[PDB]
Design an enzyme around this catalytic site. Structure first.
Site, mmCIF file in Angstrom:
data_model
loop_
_atom_site.group_PDB
_atom_site.id
_atom_site.type_symbol
_atom_site.label_atom_id
_atom_site.label_comp_id
_atom_site.label_asym_id
_atom_site.label_seq_id
_atom_site.Cartn_x
_atom_site.Cartn_y
_atom_site.Cartn_z
ATOM 1 C CG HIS A 153 -2.198 -0.976 0.864
ATOM 2 N ND1 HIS A 153 -3.019 -1.455 1.872
ATOM 3 C CD2 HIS A 153 -2.622 -1.582 -0.271
ATOM 4 C CE1 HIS A 153 -3.928 -2.259 1.357
ATOM 5 N NE2 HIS A 153 -3.709 -2.360 0.055
ATOM 6 C CG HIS B 78 -3.557 -5.638 -7.628
ATOM 7 N ND1 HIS B 78 -3.366 -4.381 -7.102
ATOM 8 C CD2 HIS B 78 -4.511 -6.227 -6.866
ATOM 9 C CE1 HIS B 78 -4.156 -4.222 -6.054
ATOM 10 N NE2 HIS B 78 -4.867 -5.323 -5.895
HETATM 11 CL CL CL Z 1 -6.232 -8.621 -8.970
#
Ligand code: CL
Length: 391
Positions: free
Chosen positions: A248, A377
């Site tokens: 993060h 991602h």
């Molecule tokens: Cl993902």
């Protein structure tokens, strides 16, 4: 010898991951299947999650923009129909979190969910669905009506189906909302979206980070003071894990560098560098390779599992930091992150990435992509790197 910084590599990698999911993820009855084994077989066809339903719209939209494949544009429409016709509750404007056989299983209204819905609709407008501009405006209005807290410059996290909020405040939904607001701006050109993204970045990466020694902690109380104990006894919770999440910190570094592209302001890059440099120092396994999942406030690694998205967000951040700063140490980070990922995390037999490995780089099981994982991602990181290299 593989050139991880080339468009050739990045495009091929994206196409390899698309070949894993497409067309097996498409449910002709509605939406996408959300649970896949390593070999692509579906291990739970009935349970559906809002985060997968929306992320698959991103997968296919960004792939259509890159490659032009008609089947991908068709899949964007199919995915958006599922979000609007099955997840969305016309009476409340809220979205089912989970479904089982098109029946609502969990009707909790998660801000994290709405960030992903905003992102899916922004993707819809990017591929030319003009109606998506209105769906974006409807989602903005819903967020302003229930979730936005102007006094803090941040969104509240979680409400029941009658909009009764809990006291939990979370950085993660705000982080994804900053991402969604950037996408909304890119799709629509509306200044309000870019400006809201900037407010969220400022509040999280400056004000909130100041309360935790310069890194972003996940969990807060109703006054946005740090909650050091939240999920200490359930520390591998999927959306609300315990500990500092290096992934993060680097993801924020990436978002700040995307903001720096659209907004002229001095603070973004130095804050990005502070987040990235500290996060990778604390979490890179110099012995076995890869960034560990979590570290406690004393610096001690509290979860040494190696997750796909941590590596991906970090290499996207490293590429953006390298290009903006001219500092070659950031390209060295990029290269080592990819070397780790290529050797251990990318499935060279079937494509797409494994979700996680243990600290010794061993597989836990064959559940490549459970609900929540669509390789948004990993493909997203590659699409982002494609914005700063020659294509
Ligand atoms: Cl993902």
């Amino acid at each position: 010898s593989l050139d991880f910084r080339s468009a050739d590599f990045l495009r091929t990698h994206i196409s390899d991951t698309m070949a894993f999911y497409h067309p097996r993820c498409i449910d002709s009855a509605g939406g996408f299947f959300h649970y896949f084994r390593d070999d692509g077989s579906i291990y739970n066809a009935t349970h559906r999650h809002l985060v997968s339903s929306t992320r698959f719209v991103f997968n296919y939209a960004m792939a259509y923009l890159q490659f032009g494949t008609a089947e991908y544009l068709d899949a964007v429409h199919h995915g958006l129909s599922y979000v609007r016709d099955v997840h969305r509750n016309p009476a409340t404007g809220g979205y089912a979190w989970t479904l089982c056989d098109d029946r609502v299983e969990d009707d909790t209204n998660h801000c994290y969910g709405l960030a992903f819905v905003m992102l899916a609709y922004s993707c819809g407008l990017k591929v030319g669905i003009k109606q998506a501009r209105e769906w974006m405006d409807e989602t903005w209005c819903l967020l302003e009506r229930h979730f936005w807290d102007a006094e803090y410059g941040l969104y509240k996290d979680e409400a029941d189906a009658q909009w009764n909020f809990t006291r939990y405040r979370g950085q993660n939904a705000n982080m994804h909302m900053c991402e969604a607001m950037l996408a909304a701006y890119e799709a629509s050109g509306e200044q309000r979206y870019l400006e809201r993204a900037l407010v969220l970045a400022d509040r999280i990466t400056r004000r909130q980070a100041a309360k935790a020694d310069g890194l972003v902690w996940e969990h807060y109380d109703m006054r946005w003071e740090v909650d050091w104990d939240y999920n200490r006894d359930n520390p591998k919770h999927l959306f609300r894990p315990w500990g500092f999440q290096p992934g993060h910190q680097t993801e924020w570094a990436k978002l700040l560098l995307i903001l720096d592209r659209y907004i002229e302001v001095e603070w973004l890059v130095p804050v990005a560098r502070s987040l990235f440099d500290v996060a990778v120092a604390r979490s890179w396994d110099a012995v076995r390779g890869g960034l560990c999942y979590g570290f406690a406030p004393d610096g001690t690694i509290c979860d040494d599992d190696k997750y796909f998205w941590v590596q991906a967000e970090s290499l996207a951040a490293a590429a953006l930091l390298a290009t903006r700063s001219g500092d070659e140490r950031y390209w060295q980070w990029y290269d080592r992150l990819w070397a780790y990922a290529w050797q251990h995390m990318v499935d060279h037999r079937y494509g797409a990435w494994y979700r996680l490995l243990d600290g010794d780089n061993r597989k836990y099981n064959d559940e490549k992509s459970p609900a929540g994982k669509t390789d948004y991602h990993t493909m997203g990181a590659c699409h982002e790197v494609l914005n700063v290299v020659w294509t």
